[PDB]
Structures are given as structure tokens and as C-alpha cells.
Amino acid sequence: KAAAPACPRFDDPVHAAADPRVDVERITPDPVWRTTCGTLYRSDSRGPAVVFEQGFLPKDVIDGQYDIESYVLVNQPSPYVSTTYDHDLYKTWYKSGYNYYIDAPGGVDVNKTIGDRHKWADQVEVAFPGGIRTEFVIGVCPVDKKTRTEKMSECVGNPHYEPWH
């Protein structure tokens, strides 16, 4: 047995951003940044050919919804790409198609930022302002709609993944 080490700390809180035009000063409320470095996950209907090329780009870093709770409660175009601590959250999506695996520094820990009492605290979300570059996307597993399970013989690793810890 070995105990795990601690995580590297990047000076830039949006070091992972695919779109660095994100304005961290406009995040509300004041963000509590994730300091751990475990695998995160994201349900996305887009195929790996798309995501592995572009990374996870946010829908509107300029004029989007910068308020976390507003974005959590009412999904609308925002500077954030949503991820979860929960490997199994894909089972709650309607035909989300893929469960992406992410190894990225930072992100805003939603429940630490807005509390764990809101309606969707159960999503244990980490919101990445500016999105996530492809080098931090590990890979993906397709989801079988009927059983809400991963098709594990069809998982694919991202050739652009660059381990950093």
C-alpha cells in the first residue's frame, strides 16, 4: 500500500481554460476553487472526434451568465463548462451519449461556493470558467441509453491527453 501525494497548485486559477477571455473578476459569488486533482466527469452528447479536437469550449464567455447559482438553477449560455465529481452522474442524463473523463486543475467547486442546500447539490458540480483544453480530457466512454451503463469496450483515450501529476 501507498498513500497518495498532494496536488500541484497552478498560479492561474483558469490555467485549464480553453477560452482564456473568461473574466474571473465577474464570477459571482466569490468562487471557492477546487484544489484536488481527482478524475472529473462530464456528460456530453458530442462525439470524441469533436471534443478531442476542440476541448470543452464554453458557450458564451463574453455575455453569458457569470452567476453560478443562476447558471446551476437555469441552464443558460455561460462562461462555464460543467463537470462533476460523480462518475455515475451520467445515469441521470436523458440520452447524453458519452461520459467524458477529465484530469484538469482548478474549476469552481459549486457546492463549496453556493452551499450544498440548493436543488441540484446532488450533482456535486465543478464549473470550469473558460472551459477545458483537450490536453486535460483523458478520454470517454459511450453510454448505452437503454441500461444507463458505459460501453466499456468502446471507451476511447484522447491522444491529446497530457498527464501533469
Judge if the upstream peptide bond of residue 29 is cis by omega within 30 degrees of 0: yes
Counting residues that bind ligand NAI (by CB under 6 A) gives 17
Phi-psi label, residue 139: left if phi above 0, alpha if psi -120 to 50, beta otherwise = left
Triad 137, 143, 149: Cα angle to 5°: 115
The CA distance from 36 to 91, in Å, is 24
The CA distance from 56 to 134, in Å, is 7
Only one of the segments 1-9, 77-85, 137-145, 156-164 lies at the binding site for ligand NAI (rule: CB under 6 A); that segment is 77-85
Q: Which of 35, 36, 45, 70 binds ligand NAI (CB under 6 A)?
A: 45
Q: Does 59 bind ligand NAI (CB under 6 A)?
A: yes
Q: Does 65 bind ligand NAI (CB under 6 A)?
A: no
Report the binding-site residues for NADH: 42-43, 45, 57, 59, 71, 75, 125
- Site of interaction with ligand NAI (CB under 6 A): 42-46, 57, 59, 72, 75, 81-84, 89, 120, 123, 125
